[PDB]
Symmetry: C6
Subunit: 313 residues, 6 copies
């Protein structure tokens, strides 16, 4: 539907930051599954269970075939490599889905999604009404107009009761902010762990005859780039959700003050909201104040009275 | 069609839990077919038909070429590996399809799908009727209104006879719950079976000269992750279907009590349902009570009488 | 078009059974083309042209390079492997297409597809007619109504002549049933033929120096699974087409008995069908009896007479 | 557009036979580019420049590395292999496109495509006209009806002049029939040429030290299957285009005989066609005779006279 | 939009010739990136820095491992191979895009694309006008008709001023013709350059110990086929653009002669075009003369006068 | 929506230059991930830590196996290769996205996107108004016309207040121009860095026994082509954005001069713009001056007065 209105700018960047976050998660994963391999080599002179590093030059020979060379690469990869280096693309992808699920849950939860689809449905008609064009400053339009005055009154009573919508949007962003804090807590705490050069001591000498081997992870660099890039990405994410939250706290969105509009419209009979209907009003005000302005007329009783006089006449 | 109304929240999470369940089933399968390989190495000093594990160090030589190294990998993979480790992604995929087939069968079975497509078709018009806007508190609308009063009466008689729809939805969720119990019965019972390090004794010494070989499954870890992840996923699935079932049992959905609505509408002439028409009413009530409220007016005979007086006039 | 009505439940499961049948046919084929390889090894001590199977252990050497190892794998694969093991996915795919072609041929054959597109086109209008809503228990609607009475009479005469449609649907399912019987006749007769371990005696000793070689087909297991799975699948297919056929035979679908409906409608003037128009009626009755019920009114001459009196008036 | 009418059953099977023809052409090509490789081995004891075929057994050694083994495979593949074996999938694909281009050229050629888009456009309206429903056995409809009588008369004169459309459809199928004959002339003449086992004598002994080598084409079998399958496919193609051609010759489609319809309609004033307008009529008659029947009324002058009397009145 | 009218047959074949041109460009490129490899072998007895070509036979040994065999293949590929052999698919693709850009630039350039979208927009209405049906041989239609007479007069003045559209179409085809001449100038001049067998003298003996090496490009044949195929393709392209150009030159398209139509319509008051409005007329005349014929009536002043008399009346 | 109007020719080439820029970025990246490999060979006689380059010829032997040959290739690739050579396709892709984000941000920013969607919405109706057709030289149209006069007056006041739209478009192109300058600053400064032949001195002799190795990057050439091609591409990009910027500076787009149009229309009562409404007018003028011309009539008060007199009458 026309839910583009329903997403402020802090939700729209958030939409696309939650897309390139996916694109690196998939791009790293499809890369990981492709090779994610290592090249493990022994060390003859070992000290500390570490490579002691002790005419023309010639090649060294360890007298080993291809498979046990492949075997040793698996083990040092299996055990002497960090889980974080291996499951990095599969991890942020998981996180990328939550930030999506923690937006569309709002739109998709039925007890609210009816309220949303109702709130929008009336506002287009109110935005499109010919009669407000007169009242903002024929008879068939009056029947249509008054027909809308009634459901507006029922809608005003039907949805102002609940408070679940504001609770969800609150419950939604608050966890995503909480979620953001943890990603930075551990991810930086292990980004140092990945690195090209690595040494493994794995205790297989009945099979090869060597104990310690030096390997080399070719992708440790690139995965470091995505992490530093991803972290920098998610930092900008974390500030977006922080800002709108403070805005949700500072502004006290349960109620809306019509008192500025009623000066201009010169309508002394217009009520304020109580709960769950000013929040959605507070939202669409963020898109623009226009739709809220056109809505003052269908709410005022004297505006109906003006129609009712013109309709009787 | 507009079957989004037809799926409560317990059916909507169920829809998407039955999507990522697919995504790991395909992601594991496309991974499995790619390599699903092993690296089998012999053991010179064997005891118990097990690897006895008995200047500078040097490589061991078994004096073997690439193919018989590939050959032995197949056999130990073929026979000394668990079917569960190999066919895991192809298995949950199968299960993933059933949970889909055990939802759309309801929508797709024709003896009911007509009833559903009829039940929805009338309710939009009843939801969209201008005349209820008056009656909930012109003449052309009355012909349209009374035209709907009749088919409503025929629909009220046509579908209230059967009870197949409630039987299907019952027969549907009950097997999915039953299905969930079995997945946990065996899957945990064999998740321990998969593991990186494995040893095979395969009796081929006329061809290699060795009997026992130690292999290494590189993917045993990741498949363990998907299983523990999948099982945790399906647990949340199993609770969803459990809850709605209890709700289907506790609430006695064959009949619906209008008696709360008739207080507010102030309509003493409004009948209750008997069977297969309150269940579908009980459903859409879960989406919202609104559509049920607008439907009280087209059902009451005095409401028709009110129209009939206004239509005669 | 709206041909969903045209497919009973025995045609709808048949539609989707003829989809997963495809998915394994393609999944096996794309797998087959990928490797479908073998690992052929010689046997030094041979008896019967069979592998006689005659300090620490050491590797055996046949003194052979990679290509002639690849060469021998081709030949034993080429000649000492069953065609059924190799062309299995390419075979059921062929069969999968026939079961599709042996459904849409009905819809696509023009001499009938006009009749179908005509039969449906009138029935929507008859289903949608406002006047039947009165007659089932204004003047502009009468012109529209009587306009439909005429083409109905012409349609009643135009299509009741032929009998090709019933012949096609008969000729269609009968071959698919016949087709199903053969798939089970040979496929089980050769599913035993595939197997992991195989031995080939191929007479190439001028090139290798060995005669007999033991190979190993890694995919013999999985292809056995698809076959047992496919066969179990097609068994359920074969029963579907068997049931509707018996139903086509038991029920004598050339003619339809209106005699039950005419009791309820209280219309003594309503004729029965003769041929090729009750069959299509017998079909849509399977979807629901409703559309047939709404159609009794446009067929009865007194119903036209009732309109004709109201139209004259 | 609604050009489904424009394709008889001989054009519709032809459409889909020209699809699976593509699917094997692409499936063979994507397979060919993948490997299309050979395994060339020397022969020590040669006679006639042919492999003379002259304790336990042991491997033979030619003392050769991997690349010159790869080198020799290219040359014997390059020169001592038939072009037909290598370019088979790329060849029928070419032919597959012609049979498509030799259908849509008709629809796409503008001097005719206007005539087609005109012929169809009028016939829907004539099919949809309410007034023919009366005349086949109000005033606003008469203006619409007579409005169509005029452009029909102009269309009758505008397009009956030319004869290009019948010439194209003739020129179209005649070459496709001619084309079919050649495919069978050469393709069977070289299908014998492909085969698994092959021997090459290539004169490179300064580089390897051997002259003659025996290779093995692994795909010679499968390509033989596609050819025998393709040829059997195109035979069924060749008969389709043969049949409609004879039908185009036997039936003398430049003119159409209305004389059967005019008996039933009881209209003695109705003219026959001369050229290029009966052919398109002869076509749509093949789809059904109905549309031609509804068209007799807008063509008869007395039918206009009947309208003209009712329009004057 | 409905720009199918805007492309004559010489533009429509040109559209599809510029599609298969793409399909070989991509098919060669995706093939090139896949391997595009060589098999370089040394030559022991060299003369002229060329391979001198100087019991049973045995393999020759150069005593070399896999990588320096891979190394040498790169260098002889890098330096002793023609750029044309390597970048062929990436080259015609570039050219394939220009011929597309040198068509849609016309449609996409805004100063004209408004004129085109205006010229088409009026012509549909003029084609669809009911009143021309009378005039080619009610009052509300006259207001609509005369409403169109005015904008036609303004359009006649608004666009006849410029001459950019004819200049673009001229400037467009002239470069594509010029472009075609160059492709044949160089491409044939280097198609001889590619070839299977090649020899490289690369001066690396400190690393291998050999100087000269004979390589073999396996794809030199196929790329030769695409070039000869592509060149033959583009020849047919080059004639298309040549023909329409001569037609643009011979015919003097700045002005259009109405003088043939005005005989048939019997309208002595109808003006000819001057510039940029007869060219677009000359175009659509190529699609068909019909739309031009229907347009004579809205242009004639006496035709307006005929309407103006009927509108006054 | 119909935002094709909103993009001048300098934005349309910019759209497609920002597409092929993507196509090489992805084509280089998917190529890079595929191999991006090297072939590192040692050098026995080294001088300066550089390859000293010091019967029949024979192969040199370094006595090394495949993996340590693979190992050394990683290290010289890892450390002795430029980051620019490796991350080139991943870099311009990043830049390619900015130039896209630095266009759609304008369309997507909500505080303006409402203004844009409003500005367009009124202009279609004004373009489509029948009454302007009269006024540029009935009563129901006057109500529609005057209805538009009012919202035009409100729109004239509502949006002329702000100046954010002109600020964004300014802030948008100015950074893209600034961005272009940097790409040329560094990219040419390192394009020399990539090259086929390279030598690495990496200090691993405990593992191989050699210190210095000569490698060869096979893709250094092609990446050089894309860079020189890309740079030439982006130069043409950089001039486009330069031109429109100067045009935005020279022309003083905050205000628009109606004074030329008012001569032709002969309307002395028509006001000029002040800010943020002439800029968008200045834009659409670039598409064509027509829409601006039709807009003069709905803005002039005497034009309303002309309607108001005709509406009163």
């Amino acid at each position: 539907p026309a839910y583009r209105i329903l997403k402020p700018w802090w939700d729209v960047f958030t939409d696309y930051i939650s897309i390139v976050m996916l694109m690196i998660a998939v791009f790293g994963g499809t890369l990981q599954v492709t090779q994610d391999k290592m090249i493990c080599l022994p060390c003859k002179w070992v000290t500390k269970d570490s490579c002691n590093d002790s005419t023309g030059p010639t090649g060294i020979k360890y007298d080993l075939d291809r498979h046990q060379y492949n075997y040793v690469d698996a083990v040092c990869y299996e055990n002497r490599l960090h889980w974080f280096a291996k499951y990095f693309p599969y991890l942020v992808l998981l996180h990328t889905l939550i930030f999506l699920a923690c937006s569309n849950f709002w739109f998709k939860f039925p007890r609210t999604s009816s309220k949303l689809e109702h709130f929008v449905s009336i506002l287009l008609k109110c935005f499109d009404s010919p009669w407000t064009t007169r009242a903002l400053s024929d008879k068939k339009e009056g029947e249509q107009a008054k027909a809308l005055f009634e459901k507006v009154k029922k809608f005003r009573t039907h949805v102002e009761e609940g408070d679940i919508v504001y609770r969800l949007y609150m419950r939604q962003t608050i966890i995503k902010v909480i979620k953001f804090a943890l990603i930075i807590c551990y991810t930086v705490y292990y980004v140092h762990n990945i690195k090209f050069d690595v040494d493994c001591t794995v205790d297989i000498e009945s099979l090869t005859g060597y104990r310690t081997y030096r390997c080399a992870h070719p992708l440790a660099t690139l995965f470091k780039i995505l992490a530093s890039f991803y972290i920098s990405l998610v930092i900008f994410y974390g500030l977006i959700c922080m800002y709108t939250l403070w805005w949700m706290l500072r502004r006290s969105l349960k109620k809306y003050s019509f008192e500025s509009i009623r000066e201009e419209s010169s309508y002394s009979d217009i009520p304020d909201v109580k709960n769950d209907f000013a929040f959605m009003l507070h939202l669409i005000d963020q898109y623009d104040p226009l739709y809220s302005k056109r809505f003052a007329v269908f709410l005022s009783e004297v505006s109906e009275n003006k129609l009712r006089q013109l309709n009787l006449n």
